[PDB]
Amino acid sequence: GDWSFLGRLLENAQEHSTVIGKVWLTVLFIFRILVLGAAAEEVWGDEQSDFTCNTQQPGCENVCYDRAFPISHVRFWVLQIIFVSTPTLIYLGHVLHLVRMEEKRKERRIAGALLRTYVFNIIFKTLFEVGFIAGQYFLYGFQLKPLYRCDRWPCPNTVDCFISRPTEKTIFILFMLAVACVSLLLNVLEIYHLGW
Amino acid sequence: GDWSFLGRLLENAQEHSTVIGKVWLTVLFIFRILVLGAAAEEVWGDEQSDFTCNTQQPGCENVCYDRAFPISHVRFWVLQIIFVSTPTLIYLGHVLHLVRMEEKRKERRIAGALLRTYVFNIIFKTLFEVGFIAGQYFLYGFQLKPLYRCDRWPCPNTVDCFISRPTEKTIFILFMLAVACVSLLLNVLEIYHLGW
């Protein structure tokens, strides 16, 4: 995963952002992207190769892994990172557009319409963070148990399947939840600093 | 299985038995002992070696075979043959005892006490045949289905196990049932010929 281009754009957003916004971006880079690439990806590397079911039925392990893990937590976190970054890019684009328009007018910061877009950016960021949190909760909860009981065809009756690294995965699930909640708190602080 | 000694004693009983009794003994020799040794034993030879369960659990196939087949049909039929033969041996022993006593008295057939023992022999034969029939019914029924579902520990949850030769085994189950019922009819005819 090469996050270079998103990083380069979000550092530009850092130049035009509030101090709390700069903190939020630093959290995104260090506590989400960096952890994901240095720690979590490895943890989940053997998610299917080390997933085992007590059965001689061909195809059962495939369908049972798929049912247990419709989307890997790491993929979900990648999507979450991209969506919570997107409004920042929208605001930065409006910034660059107004700067280029100003340069043109000359040939021939946060107030006004730019402040309205900034605050909308903070709102959409908040809603997307909340949505991904709640989706993670309703899909997986905040804990991975070692045992998964599977009755999906072709599996005969109910089969016992065993997860790879349930405890380490639970640790990182809770870590990423905490980081997301810190991000929400930062957004709320941005909207209370702007309000005040 | 060497039935030589039982055969030699039951042929003696044939010498002292009624014509219907001789038919009964012939049925025992030809349609039970001979079939058991020439056909059924082979059918059941691979009862456990060819019994298969869809599982990776060590020990599950053992416990599941044991639960499905607490006693093999062939062992049950051996026991049945021996018990339905036993009263015949009792009657023959009473016969030989009275003959030896007569020889002694000389030194120094079916009436009297010998007829009472004969009729008791026919009664116990009938009750034992009925008992083994009903036991077979309550234990296995009169049909072996290919699939046996097993939840006995250590088997995880419910496991699918497959029987060896279910249809051939069902054929021989029904054959042996029919032979037993013919034997019962013969006993009833003995008691109606004696009554008349």
Side-chain angles (χ1 to χ4, degrees), chain B:
Chain B
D2 189 29
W3 302 84
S4 63
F5 284 81
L6 174 66
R8 299 216 182 137
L9 304 193
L10 296 171
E11 277 188 77
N12 299 342
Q14 216 168 25
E15 283 214 8
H16 298 97
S17 57
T18 309
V19 59
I20 302 176
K22 300 183 189 190
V23 179
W24 184 92
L25 291 170
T26 294
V27 169
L28 185 75
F29 287 128
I30 298 309
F31 286 86
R32 297 215 247 190
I33 293 171
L34 173 61
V35 167
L36 199 52
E41 280 176 26
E42 201 74 13
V43 174
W44 271 264
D46 51 60
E47 59 195 343
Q48 182 161 227
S49 59
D50 293 347
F51 181 93
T52 60
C53 298
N54 188 339
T55 187
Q56 295 179 301
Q57 179 60 240
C60 179
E61 274 184 5
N62 281 35
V63 301
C64 294
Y65 174 84
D66 182 75
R67 188 166 274 183
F69 302 107
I71 180 168
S72 173
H73 298 75
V74 282
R75 253 76 77 186
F76 186 87
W77 290 330
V78 164
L79 292 175
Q80 182 177 2
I81 283 162
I82 288 170
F83 281 72
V84 302
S85 304
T86 301
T88 306
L89 303 175
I90 297 177
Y91 163 82
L92 173 72
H94 183 197
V95 161
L96 298 179
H97 181 76
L98 295 201
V99 167
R100 187 171 57 89
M101 173 175 296
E102 192 72 355
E103 175 176 349
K104 284 184 178 178
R105 178 176 178 178
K106 180 62 183 302
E107 288 293 355
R108 64 178 66 185
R109 294 183 181 278
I110 316 191
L114 225 49
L115 158 66
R116 185 188 159 212
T117 299
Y118 192 84
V119 175
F120 260 42
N121 141 86
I122 309 291
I123 298 275
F124 279 52
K125 290 171 64 177
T126 302
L127 301 182
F128 293 176
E129 203 75 61
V130 172
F132 279 92
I133 286 169
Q136 163 58 11
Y137 176 70
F138 284 104
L139 202 55
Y140 294 123
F142 297 128
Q143 173 180 12
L144 301 193
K145 292 295 183 67
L147 172 67
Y148 179 70
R149 289 222 166 77
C150 181
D151 66 352
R152 187 177 186 195
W153 183 90
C155 310
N157 317 313
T158 304
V159 158
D160 280 0
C161 304
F162 301 88
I163 309 304
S164 169
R165 311 178 192 257
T167 301
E168 194 168 38
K169 286 180 181 168
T170 295
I171 289 160
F172 276 92
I173 288 161
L174 291 168
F175 180 92
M176 287 306 271
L177 176 66
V179 170
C181 291
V182 166
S183 304
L184 282 174
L185 179 65
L186 293 171
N187 294 337
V188 168
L189 287 198
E190 291 171 84
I191 271 167
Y192 147 90
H193 187 58
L194 293 185
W196 293 56

Side-chain angles (χ1 to χ4, degrees), chain A residues 11 48 50 110 132 142 176 178:
Chain A
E11 277 188 77
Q48 182 161 227
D50 293 347
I110 316 191
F132 279 92
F142 297 128
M176 287 306 271

Side-chain angles (χ1 to χ4, degrees), chain A residues 104-135:
Chain A
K104 284 184 178 178
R105 178 176 178 179
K106 180 62 183 302
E107 288 293 355
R108 64 178 66 185
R109 294 183 181 278
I110 316 191
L114 225 49
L115 158 66
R116 185 188 159 213
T117 299
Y118 192 84
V119 175
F120 260 42
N121 141 86
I122 309 291
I123 298 275
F124 279 52
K125 290 171 64 177
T126 302
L127 302 182
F128 293 176
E129 203 75 61
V130 172
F132 279 92
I133 286 169

